[PDB]
């Protein structure tokens, strides 16, 4: 019955070359503790050196979500001991988040609801502690990888809205090319918070962090499951109060794994070792002009300018890459709808059974357009199409070429 106030916590891995405060590589091999250095190892007397692009990229996302980029901004130290957190303090941002008060519009039963995002700051991922028997083994390869947190206001009101938000946020950050946003690769992570407020309570319900959500689909389940969990338990006695919960991927439930005693003291305090950042207006601009046209703006175009199906505009604009390829293929003469079906159909297939990125293949908005026309020319039947594409796709170069570098034409 009661309202379901819940917000999402999405950590995002930046795909920079080097870690957040160290010059170590951000992409590491399988070999454990082989992608570290004195800094990641927290050896005594080392210092942090802020990754410049990181900041660039961070404030770019913040602006993508329509946040208000801070002018004065510095890092702080989040104190806490844990094997995969060597300094015993993760560098992050307390009061002056590089980003604040943003929002993304989603569409729920019927009409548009605007979910606002409270903040977006820069942190550093921690090492990984493999639990091997009695003892656990520590691997710092990942330690220090740049991260951006995106705290959503508690404006999202359902496990289905939750999905909606995450699906947008992801898509958007994606277009910013600052990350690959893949939960499969853990470069997109979500911690949820749910709490039921009997419609017309003012004071929010009592939230319960929902760890171990490793995918939009999953975040949904846990979210709706826990929604019921406490719904009924709120008919019994019950509080489900200041409690944390892990999500069992097989049963599909929420396991209680602790119960806050008060508030986790981290002794937040401004990192002295890092001079303060002053984001002048010219800085904001540089990174301002780096935000490509976001999905909603593109789709609208597609639907109301290129006379395209709304569903198509969808698929076609899930990821910036394709979207672009699409937009180019058409300014190349290729039929509008025909382009769309080849990207949704043909092309995507190829990409799938070869798990290759659309830009690593050997086709170009040009050589594609070339083939499309040949079809709308009649010069090539759809029969021949399924033949010339596969080759023209990756490790190919021209459209007619395969008709003569092989043998078929008209």
């Amino acid at each position: 019955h009661f309202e379901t106030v819940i917000g999402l916590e999405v950590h995002v891995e930046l795909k920079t070359d080097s870690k957040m405060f160290s010059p170590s590589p951000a992409h590491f091999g399988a070999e454990p503790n082989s992608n570290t250095n004195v800094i990641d190892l927290a050896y005594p007397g080392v210092l942090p050196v802020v990754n410049k692009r990181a900041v660039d990229w961070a404030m770019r996302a913040a602006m993508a979500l329509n946040m208000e980029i801070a002018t004065e901004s510095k890092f702080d130290r989040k104190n806490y001991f844990y094997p995969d957190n060597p300094k015993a303090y993760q560098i992050s941002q307390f009061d002056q988040p590089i980003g604040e008060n943003g929002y993304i519009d989603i569409e729920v039963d019927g009409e548009t609801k605007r979910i606002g995002i409270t903040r977006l700051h820069m942190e550093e991922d921690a090492g990984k502690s493999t639990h091997k028997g009695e003892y656990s083994l520590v691997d710092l390869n990942r330690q220090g990888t740049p991260l951006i947190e995106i705290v959503s206001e508690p404006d999202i009101r359902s496990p289905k809205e939750a999905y909606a938000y995450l699906e947008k946020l992801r898509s958007i950050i994606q277009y910013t090319g600052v990350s690959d946003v893949k939960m499969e690769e853990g470069s997109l992570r979500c911690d949820a918070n749910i709490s039921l407020r009997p419609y017309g309570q003012e004071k929010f319900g009592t939230k319960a962090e929902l760890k171990n959500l490793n995918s939009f689909n999953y975040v949904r389940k846990g979210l709706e499951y826990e929604e019921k969990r406490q719904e009924e338990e709120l008919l019994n006695g019950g509080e489900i109060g200041q409690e944390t919960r892990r999500f069992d991927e097989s049963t599909g439930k929420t396991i209680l794994m602790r119960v806050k005693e008060g508030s986790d003291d981290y002794r937040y305090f401004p990192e002295p070792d890092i001079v303060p950042l002053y984001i002048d207006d010219a800085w904001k601009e540089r990174v301002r002009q780096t935000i490509p046209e976001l999905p909603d703006e593109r789709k609208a175009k597609y639907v109301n300018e290129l006379g395209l199906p709304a569903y198509d505009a969808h698929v076609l604009t899930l990821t910036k890459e394709m979207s672009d390829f699409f937009e180019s293929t058409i300014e190349h003469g290729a039929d509008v709808k025909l382009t769309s079906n080849w990207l949704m159909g043909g092309v995507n297939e190829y990409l799938n059974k070869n798990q290759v990125e659309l830009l690593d293949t050997k086709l170009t908005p040009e050589n594609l357009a070339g083939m499309i026309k040949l079809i709308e020319d009649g010069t090539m039947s759809s029969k021949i199409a399924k033949k010339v594409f596969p080759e023209l796709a990756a490790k190919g170069g021209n459209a007619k070429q395969i008709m003569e570098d092989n043998g078929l034409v008209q």
């Binding site: 070359d17 080097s18 082989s34 250095n37 639990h131």
Partner: protein, 98 residues
Amino acid sequence: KVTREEVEHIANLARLQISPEETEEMANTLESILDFAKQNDSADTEGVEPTYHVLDLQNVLREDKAIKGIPQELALKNAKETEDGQFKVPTIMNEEDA
């Protein structure tokens, strides 16, 4: 003030072990240091900003170019407990809750 528990809470916050005999002692010492630290209360700080950095520098950012990580050899060279190429540490979680 400065009660036993508070001493244990601090001692708990930072990771330092302290048995009683040293806790009721730390109860006094902390009580003193703090009595001492109360001195700043004679300093008029109404509306004066806190100094975070003494050096007025600005925007020191490192160019995003990666540098190879040091060999697992070195990373580990100074750690006493290690295996399979990692740092070895207990894990039956926290003492008297785990």
